[PDB]
Ligand binder design. Sequence first.
Ligand code: 2KH
Ligand code: 2KH
Ligand code: MN
Lengths: 628, 629
Amino acid sequence: TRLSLEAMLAERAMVARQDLAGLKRKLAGADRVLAPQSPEQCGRESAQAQARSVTSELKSAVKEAQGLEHQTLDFLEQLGEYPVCGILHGDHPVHPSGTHNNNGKVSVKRQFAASDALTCAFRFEDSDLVRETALKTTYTDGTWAGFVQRLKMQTTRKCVQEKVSRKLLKQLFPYDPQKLVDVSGELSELVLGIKTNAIASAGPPYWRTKRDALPDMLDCVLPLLYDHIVRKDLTTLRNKHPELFLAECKNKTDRYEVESLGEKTRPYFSHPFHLSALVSVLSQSFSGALKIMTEDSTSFNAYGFSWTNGGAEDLAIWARQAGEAGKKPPRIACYGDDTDIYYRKDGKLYRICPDFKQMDGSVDATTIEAVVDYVVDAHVKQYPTARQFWEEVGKLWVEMATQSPFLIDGTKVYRKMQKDGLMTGVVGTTLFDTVKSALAYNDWADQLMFGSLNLLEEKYAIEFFKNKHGLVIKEGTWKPALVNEDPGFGELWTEQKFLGLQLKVVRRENEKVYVPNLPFEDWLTMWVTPRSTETMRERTLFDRARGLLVTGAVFDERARGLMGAVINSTAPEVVCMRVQISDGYPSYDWVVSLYSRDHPCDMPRVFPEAATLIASYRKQVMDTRVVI
Amino acid sequence: TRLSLEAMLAERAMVARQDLAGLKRKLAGADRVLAPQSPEQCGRESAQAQARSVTSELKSAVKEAQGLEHQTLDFLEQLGEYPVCGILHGDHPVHPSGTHNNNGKVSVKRQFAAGSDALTCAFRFEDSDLVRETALKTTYTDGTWAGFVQRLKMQTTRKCVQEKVSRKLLKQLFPYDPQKLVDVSGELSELVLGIKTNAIASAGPPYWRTKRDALPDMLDCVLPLLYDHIVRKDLTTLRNKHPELFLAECKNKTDRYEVESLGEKTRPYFSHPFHLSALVSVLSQSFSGALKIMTEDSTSFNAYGFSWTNGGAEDLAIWARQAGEAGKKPPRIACYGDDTDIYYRKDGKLYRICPDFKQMDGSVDATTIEAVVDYVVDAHVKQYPTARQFWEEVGKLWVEMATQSPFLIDGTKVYRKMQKDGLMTGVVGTTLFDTVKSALAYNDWADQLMFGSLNLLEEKYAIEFFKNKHGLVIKEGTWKPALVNEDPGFGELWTEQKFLGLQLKVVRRENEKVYVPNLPFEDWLTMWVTPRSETETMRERTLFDRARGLLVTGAVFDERARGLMGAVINSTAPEVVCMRVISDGYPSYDWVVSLYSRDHPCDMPRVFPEAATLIASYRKQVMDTRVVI
RNA sequence: AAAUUU
RNA sequence: CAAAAUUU
RNA sequence: AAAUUU
RNA sequence: CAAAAUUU
Ligand SMILES: O=c1ccn([C@@H]2O[C@H](COP(=O)(O)NP(=O)(O)OP(=O)(O)O)[C@@H](O)[C@H]2O)c(=O)[nH]1
Ligand SMILES: O=c1ccn([C@@H]2O[C@H](COP(=O)(O)NP(=O)(O)OP(=O)(O)O)[C@@H](O)[C@H]2O)c(=O)[nH]1
Ligand SMILES: [Mn+2]
């Protein structure tokens, strides 16, 4: 009741942005700063019909592939059935009563189920292109057949142990010791500091979101785990409550090639919240301290690299200092299985952008153990009072990464027969892949110095990584290319992709700004396969179009036109409504600014008078000093 | 959707306090710090039945009194009918279609309706005969036509006396800090945006909706129009073209009324246009913020701003004691509207009078009103001279609203007060105007004591004096001088009289004396059973809040009232105590004593000390990572 | 809430 | 969405 | 949101 | 709740 008028106006503002009908009415006359758009190609009805037709074909293709028989799970170790956890937190079990329980045994059921975006594509683009694009890739749960095949490939690959030491990791993966979290502090506070996905599964035995399981984890399971860690008593705990150390093997819903649905569906592992949270203390602290290649010339690390705020140009600057192959250091930087390589032949700069196939399967136990050691050691050198505890956590970490028992479908509990091979989904997954990859390329570079310059060639490179590192180069990814070291306006560094994107130079006045880029076809693939009321659907179209523009679609003339069309199609009320109000849009100029070294600024408003129109008030200066 | 666990816990905490069902489950049986309470007298069904029975009698009494004929409104000037305002703000009229409009004329309909959980609680925990007689004596009601018109006439037609007043005299009685005054030479929009108001109060004509709903129409449309016409000396053009912009509504106040006197007494007030009140509030609120009170400055007669808390109750006593021998040295006099505390000595002994004026607004003369407006405007322009002319124009509007505004009552007929004298209660500054008139009269009273007229201490001559010399009527039985207990014993009263509706009492804390407000049980009980007013939960929560409020105001210092409020508090379900709406605390005796003392502020004690952790299902446990393994 | 990436 | 990096 | 006061 | 003062 008793409120200042200023405050009252603010309250009215918030409330107003929730009333769609009122927004629609107040914005109805407003000047709209339209995005650049390409013209319509056909009407709603035709576009919907074409979308329906494509969706219908995809649905049958997916349903057929999902119907395929899957091969036996004999390649895994069998450990029988596990009893459901009996642990109570107050008046309820930590494992909910009616869930994931077949006659007292833990059970799971894999889901393999069978577009607004697609309609937009047909509305604004050539039918044949949209149709062939939409029929090649689909966002899907995948297939049993594909799931099991990839699982086998991930769990039974012949690996090679890397030759690694702390000295070598210090060189390739330098970090700032002062940025490491003081893990000598009290454990509860440290755990409370970790970030996570609130709606991700908390794993066994919570069988609900991390948000829902949080109290059960912190108040009940974590102290129990701590007590048993510090008393060297984990085996008692494991035997009495096996579900506390159980993972779930899941099929990843993803953008999969329709052609290969029955051969390829990615598995990952969801671990218990209490274990992942504990390991995250070390892992997230270490991530925060890690340098990237653009900050330290010895680092092979791109885990942490950003294209924005000069990053794209930093990559180029870093790359150019690469030396003559066999004489001076190349420039190599790794992010998981994805690597950018620069070297000179007769002073000319070359680039390779190779990838590894099902890489996690090739990550050897030595590399995993060395990475855990390096992270643990980094912390205990800086905070020595807590050495023993964190070494124990180190052991759990390694176990989760290599040997965790797991469910797939039903009650049968499996384990990977060999220790080698990374259990994708463990905390630190990406770091493990990055390190394995970097050790291999570090060895590769050493061999160049010893004179073996034929390792620059596809044939010998593929042989080398297979034989010497147990790593499989993805077909067609070893294609050295002459780099455009100083690109012209609108020209590319090379046609190759690193971290899914090409590097290009665009003009601003007479300056060159380095920005990400892809051909239209790639942007279109992303557009028509979203990674998923009428109002929320309309708003999602708006948001996805903005996102793609920002990522680099704005620098492709056809993609920019498509995204702009979608943006301009979004009703004013949907643009301006309160959301989890973002009523700006990525203009070309703003996106260029984002990738440049400019100070951060807000996206331009779609409706510049929205604030005042929504409030039904535009301030007018009234001077109290006037002569009367 | 990626957050820290700490943040996730915080989100869960906020959500949890809104999930009543979950709160109910988690706090069921929780360790509860019970308030002191008197025992149950009867159960709910019996108490509800008794409440129903009392409510039924009150309803008939009110309905009968509302049926009484009212006297004609011929004592006011008639101005005919006003056309509804045609001003548009964008796609809508400022005066909404189909409201307050009788065939194109502004119209209004007075509401006198004949419409308790509180009463049920009273019966649950107190003697039936006492609750019943208490509840039948006072009711919260719209009042009556008969009573409304009688008080309206008394307010608009009283023979007033012009005060002898000047800036010099007001500086003396109403000192202020000039440095606290708002810089009113700033830009107008910013100044207006800075005023506080009641969001759900009527915005008046021509908006005919809440201030919250009318705010854009006011700021964006009407206020600039008003400003343009002010600065061009063109207000009469505006008045003629859009009369509704300068129209008030005369309304009946819903209030606690004696059932006996329903047909004789219902308070009238005036609701003015938002644009005019907002403008004047810039000056008035600024001035209120600068005003000193009697406990800060020995010359001040002003209690507008006084607080009983944080030593205030003791400050009153300290201030009072320095009163001198009547006819030799200054008394101690302090005014808040029509309510005044007076201290003097006869043969060195301290006496107290707590007189009140009857329908005081009717007695406030136009000279006093004009002087107060001048004093406030001048205070600002002395500090910020660049804006003199504008604020003098606002000064003129201010006077017009407080003495001569045209107004509706019921139907389309527009009235005006025939005489300029008499305050139109509801204008911005209402309380200050009353306070000043009252203080001028008492200042004169005190002067006459010095000139030798010591019989003005006596009821007979005091009443005569205020009537004849100031046009003010002392309410009967409010002039009763009393020997003050200057150093009160533990549990003793300063005197039995009320100032600002409360007695002053001394309570013991260890071996210290703390000065606190107090009333007899019957008064607290009257307040309890007549709330100044939806789920069962919100009703239960309101009971909890009213019980706490009364305790804090001083009910905690009466044994039976403390017991009643405590019983209500202890009856409140845990979920209702702990839900999102300080909130989950209760006023213990010790905490309330601390509030009235000069102690630093602290939170009320928790009803459920471990509520936070129980609700979260998490108690932090220290786990040491430095352990040897 | 959204986009890209691994 | 299992862990994650980069964006607004 | 709530109590008292004018 | 017409303007308000004090308080939680
Ligand atoms: O969502 C993801 C995608 C990829 N990765 C990591 O990326 C690495 C390789 O990805 P992958 O092992 O999942 N299969 P992939 O190599 O993509 O097969 P292909 O279709 O031939 O390219 C693995 O080591 C994963 O751990 C993730 O951790 N999460
Ligand atoms: O709710 C209120 C009460 C009082 N007042 C103002 O304060 C003045 C005195 O306040 P008052 O409330 O004590 N009563 P008064 O009308 O003088 O006589 P009576 O009814 O017999 O006790 C009134 O005359 C009004 O101007 C208000 O503005 N609002
Ligand atoms: Mn990959």
